Design an enzyme around this catalytic site. Sequence first.
Site, PDB file in Angstrom:
ATOM      1  N   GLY B  12      25.059  10.832  76.061  1.00  0.00           N
ATOM      2  CA  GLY B  12      23.578  10.810  76.105  1.00  0.00           C
ATOM      3  C   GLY B  12      23.023   9.713  77.001  1.00  0.00           C
ATOM      4  O   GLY B  12      22.120   9.980  77.815  1.00  0.00           O
ATOM      5  N   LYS B 118      26.291  -4.365  72.938  1.00  0.00           N
ATOM      6  CA  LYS B 118      25.392  -4.721  71.814  1.00  0.00           C
ATOM      7  C   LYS B 118      25.996  -5.862  71.013  1.00  0.00           C
ATOM      8  O   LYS B 118      25.205  -6.666  70.488  1.00  0.00           O
ATOM      9  CB  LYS B 118      25.139  -3.505  70.923  1.00  0.00           C
ATOM     10  CG  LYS B 118      24.756  -2.243  71.691  1.00  0.00           C
ATOM     11  CD  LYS B 118      23.267  -2.050  71.867  1.00  0.00           C
ATOM     12  CE  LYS B 118      22.747  -0.974  70.946  1.00  0.00           C
ATOM     13  NZ  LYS B 118      21.266  -0.957  70.888  1.00  0.00           N
ATOM     14  N   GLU B 188      28.769   3.998  66.265  1.00  0.00           N
ATOM     15  CA  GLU B 188      28.522   2.588  66.689  1.00  0.00           C
ATOM     16  C   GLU B 188      27.458   1.970  65.758  1.00  0.00           C
ATOM     17  O   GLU B 188      27.582   0.781  65.406  1.00  0.00           O
ATOM     18  CB  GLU B 188      28.108   2.487  68.167  1.00  0.00           C
ATOM     19  CG  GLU B 188      29.194   2.854  69.179  1.00  0.00           C
ATOM     20  CD  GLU B 188      28.844   2.607  70.651  1.00  0.00           C
ATOM     21  OE1 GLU B 188      28.198   3.487  71.262  1.00  0.00           O
ATOM     22  OE2 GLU B 188      29.217   1.538  71.197  1.00  0.00           O
ATOM     23  N   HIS B 192      27.557  -0.863  61.707  1.00  0.00           N
ATOM     24  CA  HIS B 192      26.688  -2.009  61.308  1.00  0.00           C
ATOM     25  C   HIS B 192      26.200  -1.872  59.857  1.00  0.00           C
ATOM     26  O   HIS B 192      25.567  -2.815  59.373  1.00  0.00           O
ATOM     27  CB  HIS B 192      25.515  -2.152  62.283  1.00  0.00           C
ATOM     28  CG  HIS B 192      25.929  -2.731  63.596  1.00  0.00           C
ATOM     29  ND1 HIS B 192      26.266  -4.053  63.730  1.00  0.00           N
ATOM     30  CD2 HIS B 192      26.105  -2.155  64.807  1.00  0.00           C
ATOM     31  CE1 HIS B 192      26.602  -4.283  64.975  1.00  0.00           C
ATOM     32  NE2 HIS B 192      26.495  -3.135  65.664  1.00  0.00           N
TER      33      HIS B 192
END
Lengths: 325, 325
Positions: B12, B118, B188, B192
């Site tokens: 994406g 990130k 991903e 978290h």
Amino acid sequence: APLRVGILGFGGLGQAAARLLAPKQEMKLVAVADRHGYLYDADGIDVDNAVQAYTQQGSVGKAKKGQMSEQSIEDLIGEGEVDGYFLALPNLPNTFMADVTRQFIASGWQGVLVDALKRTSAVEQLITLREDLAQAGITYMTGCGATPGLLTAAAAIASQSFQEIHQVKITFGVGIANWEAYRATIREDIAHMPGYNVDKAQAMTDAEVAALLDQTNGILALEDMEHADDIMLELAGICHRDQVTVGGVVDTRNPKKPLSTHVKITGRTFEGKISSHTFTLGDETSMAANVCGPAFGYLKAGYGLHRQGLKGLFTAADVMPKFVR
Amino acid sequence: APLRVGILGFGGLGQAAARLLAPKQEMKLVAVADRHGYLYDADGIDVDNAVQAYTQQGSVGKAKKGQMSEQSIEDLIGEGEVDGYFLALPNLPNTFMADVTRQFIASGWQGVLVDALKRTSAVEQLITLREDLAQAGITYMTGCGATPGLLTAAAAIASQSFQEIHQVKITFGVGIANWEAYRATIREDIAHMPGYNVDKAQAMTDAEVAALLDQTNGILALEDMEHADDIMLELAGICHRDQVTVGGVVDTRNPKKPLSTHVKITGRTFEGKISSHTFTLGDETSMAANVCGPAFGYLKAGYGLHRQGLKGLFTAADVMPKFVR
Ligand SMILES: *[C@H](CCCCCC(=O)O)[C@H](C)N
Ligand SMILES: *[C@H](CCCCCC(=O)O)[C@H](C)N
């Protein structure tokens, strides 16, 4: 080895700039100059002493180690080792910043200069000096105040999300705490009022001023001002100066900011969606803090560029300022 | 002479990055690579053709001028003239970005690399490569996405008003439009979540995912995340990584942003007043736009630094990105 810096001008802005430097460990104020005198102290200025000299005896030349002089700027340049200067000068006459820069060009001193100029046309006079500055070995940071400066840079960052910029709208508020140590520079804002201009505003009396500020409870509301944010953003290839509009409110009779200063950046993204980013300043960040903070951040950034042999003119919009510790 | 650029990864993010480049006149996409193939076209990629190949036939190697290959990244590097690449790779395994960078180091190709990493720890693996990168003649721009990136830079600018920084608080929102072309990278974010980590999240099935997202109507609320904004701001001398806290909401079942993304920068000014600046993104600026926009702004900034012979690793916090036209 902290950066040895100087301030030119010791009205409200330069006095605040001196206070801001005191606790820095990595920046050492060694040099101030006003119209009538100069103070150099390679071991670091006594700001208490210098603000006393200025406000009580009319010039920092009256300070403990001060020198009176009608050539203060010329004398201080050749006086000792200064890595960079903040030109906290009013732009009066409208050529003065450019004229002081020509003294710096002419002096064969090299290092970093920063200003907080406001007016597109004063920034243009410095653009004409681009090569002169480069050739002289001087890194010049222009419009590195609040607006232009902090807010200009914010817009430059904000612009990255968009295929195309439509509007950069800057709205600023200013509350005057101490009337004494602003009424020296109040005429720079009155010049942006409709009907007025620098020549008319600068010839006004304390009386003609107070007669104007009485009409509104001490409120100058200035609309679509001549603000160098417009050309800085255009040279950075973000938008046309005409898509930058700057407006403001100063409350002369209230230390409290009369509205939240902010910059609204409107554009269309690559997906054809139209949207605005908004950068807002805290109401308790003063003009002095929003001007002099970026100014020395840019001075440090400027020294970084100078050290790598990068000279010429840079705007707030071109470089990331560096946190001064 | 537009910059010849490449994208590595065509999930994406890289597909959106390709669309974003189409109308640029001063940046020309010549190179894409995925896991299974690569596409080079020195005259400019057909994005329609490449997105078709990828989504329908599984790789851009299936595109009109595409090449299948299990060494796509190694093959494309030596394939033609590319000034810079955007590493739109997922960091899986957690070494992959660093490993791809070692291929670039090893290849003797020179130019600009940009990522949108990130995780603090992935950015650290690139810090260790600082000298390797410099020596190889490569300008590497790390964490140049939305956060880290756009928001990190905003905070770095905002910090200039303050003697001392207390908190940088980043709150982000994300609405997934197309589930297809995000569920490749959803793990991903799941990593978290509390209890989870990359290894656990990456081994999850479409089923184990959907079973988790069913518990909340497709809402991942992620709190005090491992986000490289913390180290980027610390290397820029603004604050300690511990004063940077990043949190977010992704709505998997709504294209509309579930809250306004913003960064709040709190500190004390030289006058001892404590205050916050707030940078807010428009709700209609997508993740793709807030990531890939800065990414190519940094790529251009990176080429500026590369051209002046400045190599090594730079973060979003260190340099002003340049509006790509
Ligand atoms: C220039 C504008 C002052 C900047 C306002 C910044 C803030 O919100 O602190 C003046 C009008 N000379
Ligand atoms: C990384 C965060 C996405 C950035 C949000 C920016 C915006 O508001 O568009 C994701 C969670 N992978």
